[PDB]
Design a protein around this ligand. Structure first.
Ligand code: 1VU
Lengths: 180, 668
């Protein structure tokens, strides 16, 4: 009830740092972003013991609800990090993008990247031949402040790119296609 | 006065050089390009351009028939091919002259005259240069090997009458090992390729490669310019050259310059070209070869002679005499040139890389620096062409000023998107043997007997690198806290007086404590006190810092939240992982799991039909090299290699249909 009430009012971030079973597995479904730790965190309602007892299927703890499954195939986890220390370091960086509440404007931070510079690298990215793919990320990185881009679900639904970046100090969200 | 319109039959910086000179002269310049070179710099700089053909050069820059069509289509009067492609192609010059188009370069007589080694040696004998005699006969006896050497000279080489690759070769100096070398080769060589006839000739020790340039005149005149020292090379290609050698005094320069002219005036070489000499440790100069074409080492002599070679070649081709006399040619200072390639210097000294350029900034704000480049940001470098990026030329009043300015230009020279060879150039020019001049044509092979490893840091340099990396780390941490104030939710900046860091380099972990005093960070690195002062503009590709009075330029190439930073320091990229004290103390509890690097296994990223495979087993593969092209929903998904090597097996062929995850090619 609180997680639903807070939706659209305050950001809700849930980082999974270990196994999660039963009803607990639904709170990340109500928050805004879910992150995991590779080979350490799990998300599933019932364990492999129930799957084997109910149906004639063979599965282990990583296959059923491991971080790799949820960041690559089911689309449940927004990103997995290698270990606990790196996971929290990236979480601090992610935090700095978001406002404290929905009543606040997108945060604006000190920026040294001139807002009026040109990016000549863009003129030749897009081929004239219609059947030749190009990497959309090259455009995104060249436009955003200081070439910093935070990519969400890098391994899931690769044909569309979404993520956070700053332009002239202000946090923006970026959505685009990946022709590759 | 001069030509109204000149066509250039080349691409890249050499085409740019001609376009700039023509514009200075008021001459319209026509460019040619392939379909992939349509956006290259020389195409945009030229006044008119004609597309000739597709990406491979054999159909675009060596297609003389398509070029002839472009020459007449634009009503060009003269053609300047630069170097490389059709500069020595006689059939091109013949069919070009047949149409009364002025060719800028050698005529076909000079090209054929030096066509082979026999005519070149005969010219050196007639022009009277050197070409040291050998033995015009077969050595048969045990005493002939030494008796003949006694009549001609001292350093004597024994080699097979025909063959190579060590086919009984030995180097001898005195008579005892000359006799021994012959009889060994004459009795064992018969067991290799069935031939035991030995010849003797004369050799030199630690050679230096020295060029002298000559400007020919159609009226019979010819002048010689200052020499070039071209000893730093890999895979028989030069990378660094110096103009005002060091191995010559005033008399030697005149003596050798006159001989280079004697060659040019005896074949009537009314063009610009180069004569190559080898000099031994005793300052004995021997003829090596005569070249007919503007060299790639012509932008370093110009900085000390004050000439413009392209301007002069165009007037000579029009029919004007040389504008100078020999008494006016002198050394006005010193100039050194470095060639920058898109190559990995670690992989057997220069393995080509493939890629696109995302950041590019030439050091043109520094004194005494001239950058001659054919690329612009958003340029691609590919397997079809020699991976040249630029030629960096630095000049000064003395040898130390030109070298110091070169070192500065290399650290302020931004190339990102490809792998480059700046680390190699930055270390060679500062090598104690290079500064003193003890350089031979095999210099790099003795300095780097196990390959290129990168710049090696000493104690003080490690302290400066640690202090810079630690201060830059904190500078980002402080910038992260400066928000516009939100009147609803006050933000309180943490009062962090000291930053306690654990800074891991290669295999060592250093203890660093930093504090901020405004623009300067006071950093203690394992007990050593350093003060790093800067403006700390964190967006610029070039960050200028002063560490205890020492001026450094560094580049931060990448940053991660986990503390990983990639910092280029003195040309070499160092990997440093900066954790806070707390993160480093707890990180020891993490399991050191290691995964497999399966970069040799190239699988299809997308279902569809295979339309091209660029390889067969044994083919060389560069990083980023296209291997396979798949075709689905009428597109051309290109699959590239992530590993340098050769192909071991090609599993899917063109015409085959593959799914997601199927194996296409397997590398060694
Ligand atoms: C669907 C209903 C809901 O809303 S959630 C329903 C709750 N049911 C469960 O999740 C079953 C509990 N176990 C599991 O799901 C999995 O086996 C888990 C525990 C997640 C796998 O983790 P694993 O690393 O194997 O841990 P473990 O089984 O050794 O347990 C570690 C220690 O914690 C304890 N523990 C665990 N779950 C409970 C629980 N529900 N109630 C009380 N204690 C629990 C274990 O006894 C164990 O303690 P000890 O090591 O035996 O001293």
């Amino acid at each position: 009830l609180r997680n639903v009430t807070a939706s659209g009012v305050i950001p809700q971030i849930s980082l999974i740092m270990g196994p999660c079973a039963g009803g607990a597995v639904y709170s990340p479904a109500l928050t805004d972003f879910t992150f995991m730790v590779k080979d350490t965190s799990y998300l599933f309602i019932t364990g492999p013991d129930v799957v084997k007892s109910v149906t004639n299927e063979d599965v282990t703890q990583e296959e059923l609800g491991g971080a790799k499954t949820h960041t690559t195939m089911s689309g449940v986890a927004h990103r997995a990090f290698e270990n606990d220390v790196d996971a929290l370091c990236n979480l601090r960086d992610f935090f700095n993008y978001l406002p404290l509440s929905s009543q606040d404007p997108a945060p604006v931070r000190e920026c040294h990247d001139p807002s009026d510079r040109l990016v000549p690298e863009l003129d030749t990215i897009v081929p004239l031949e219609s059947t030749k793919a190009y990497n959309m990320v090259d455009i995104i990185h060249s436009v955003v402040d200081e070439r910093e881009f935070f990519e969400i679900m890098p391994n899931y639904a690769k044909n569309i790119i979404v993520g956070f970046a700053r332009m002239n100090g202000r946090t923006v969200g970026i959505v685009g296609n990946q022709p590759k | 006065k001069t030509f109204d319109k000149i066509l250039v039959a080349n691409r890249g910086e050499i085409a740019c050089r001609v376009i700039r000179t023509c514009k200075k002269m008021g001459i319209k310049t026509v460019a040619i390009h392939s379909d992939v070179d349509a956006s290259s710099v020389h195409v945009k700089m030229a006044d008119e351009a004609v597309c000739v053909g597709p990406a491979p050069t054999s159909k675009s820059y060596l297609n003389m028939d398509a070029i002839m069509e472009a020459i007449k289509k634009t009503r060009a009067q003269a053609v300047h091919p630069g170097y490389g492609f059709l500069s020595e192609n006689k059939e091109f010059a013949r069919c070009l002259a047949a149409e009364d188009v002025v060719f800028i370069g050698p005529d076909t007589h000079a090209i054929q005259a030096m066509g082979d080694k026999i005519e070149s040696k005969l010219l050196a004998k007639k022009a009277e240069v050197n070409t040291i005699p050998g033995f015009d006969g077969v050595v048969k006896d045990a005493e002939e090997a030494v008796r003949i050497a006694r009549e001609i000279g001292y350093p004597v080489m024994i080699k097979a009458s025909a063959g190579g690759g060590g086919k009984g070769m030995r180097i001898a100096w005195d008579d005892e090992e000359t006799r021994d070398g012959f009889r060994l080769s004459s009795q064992e060589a018969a067991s290799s390729f069935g031939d035991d006839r030995l010849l003797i000739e004369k050799f030199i020790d630690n050679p230096r490669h020295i060029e002298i340039q000559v400007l020919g005149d159609k009226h019979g005149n010819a002048l010689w310019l200052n020499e070039r020292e071209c000893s730093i090379q890999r895979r028989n290609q030069k990378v660094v050259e110096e103009a005002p050698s060091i191995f010559l005094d005033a008399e030697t320069r005149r003596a050798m310059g006159e001989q280079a002219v004697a060659l040019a005036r005896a074949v009537k070489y009314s063009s610009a070209g180069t004569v190559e000499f080898l000099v031994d440790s005793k300052k004995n100069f021997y003829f090596l070869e005569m070249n007919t074409r503007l060299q790639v080492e012509h932008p370093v002599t110009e900085c000390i002679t004050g000439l413009d070679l392209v301007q002069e070649m165009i007037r000579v081709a029009k029919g004007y005499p040389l504008r100078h006399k020999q008494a006016d040619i002198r050394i006005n200072g010193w100039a050194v040139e470095c060639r920058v390639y898109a190559e990995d210097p670690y992989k057997s000294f220069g393995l080509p890389s493939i890629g696109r350029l995302s950041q590019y900034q030439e050091p043109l704000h520094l004194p005494g620096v001239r950058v001659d480049s054919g690329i612009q940001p958003g340029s691609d470098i590919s397997i079809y062409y020699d991976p040249m990026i630029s030629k960096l030329i630095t000049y000064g009043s003395d040898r130390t000023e030109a070298l110091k300015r070169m070192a500065d230009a290399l650290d302020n020279y931004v190339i990102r998107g490809v792998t480059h060879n700046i680390a190699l150039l930055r270390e060679v020019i500062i090598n104690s043997r290079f500064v003193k001049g003890d350089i031979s044509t095999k210099f790099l092979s003795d300095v780097y007997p196990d390959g290129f490893k990168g710049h090696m840091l000493t104690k003080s340099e490690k302290n400066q690198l640690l202090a810079i990396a630690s201060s830059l780390f904190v500078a980002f941490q402080l910038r992260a806290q400066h928000f516009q104030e939100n009147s609803r939710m006050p933000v309180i900046k943490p009062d962090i007086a000291n930053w306690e860091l654990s800074v891991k380099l290669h295999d060592k972990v250093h203890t660093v404590v930093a504090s901020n005093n405004g623009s300067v960070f006071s950093v203690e690195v394992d007990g050593s006190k350093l003060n790093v002062t800067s403006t700390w503009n964190l967006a610029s590709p070039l960050l200028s810092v002063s560490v205890d009075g020492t001026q450094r330029t560094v580049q931060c190439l990448s940053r991660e939240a986990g503390g990983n930073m990639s910092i280029q320091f003195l040309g070499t990229v160092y990997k440093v992982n900066i954790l806070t004290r707390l993160a480093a103390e707890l990180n020891k509890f993490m399991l050191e799991k290691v995964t497999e690097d399966t970069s040799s296994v190239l699988r299809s990223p997308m279902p569809g039909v295979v339309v091209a495979v660029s390889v067969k087993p044994g083919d060389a593969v560069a990083e980023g090299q296209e291997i396979c092209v798949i075709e689905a929903m009428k597109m051309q998904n290109s699959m590239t290699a992530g590993k340098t090597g050769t192909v071991k097996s090609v599993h899917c062929q063109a015409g085959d249909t593959v799914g997601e995850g199927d194996l296409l090619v397997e590398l060694e």
